[PDB]
Amino acid sequence: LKKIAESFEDPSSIVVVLEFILFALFFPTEFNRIKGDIQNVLLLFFSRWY
Amino acid sequence: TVTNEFASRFRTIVATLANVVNERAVQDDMQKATRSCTKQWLRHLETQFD
Known part of the structure; x- marks a missing residue:
């Protein structure tokens, strides 16, 4: 995955989550290829919001 | 460690200050x-602290 330096400080950061969901719809394959690297970002999102 | 304890402490501290400044904000x-x-x-x- 290309690096995404998100802090998820603000609700607007949901943008990045959408960016992933969309990527997982249009391109399930590459998504599955890089989803661990995506998960590193999602954990930053989840540890803040939940 | 994925998480930094020195930073997480500042996190709880800030949550406390949020409750405090919240109560003072609604009182005024x-x-x-x-x-x-x-x-x-x-x-x-x-x-910034992390």
Whole structure:
């Protein structure tokens, strides 16, 4: 995955989550290829919001 | 460690200050806008701190 330096400080950061969901719809394959690297970002999102 | 304990402590500290400044904000009937702005600056300090 290309690096995404998100802090998820603000609700607007949901943008990045959408960016992933969309990527997982249009391109399930590459998504599955890089989803661990995506998960590193999602954990930053989840540890803040939940 | 994925998480930094020195930073997480500052996180709980800031949550406490959020509750405190929240109570003082509602007691002085100040605008919702400024109040959320205080909270925003606090979470920003949280990020800088990590």
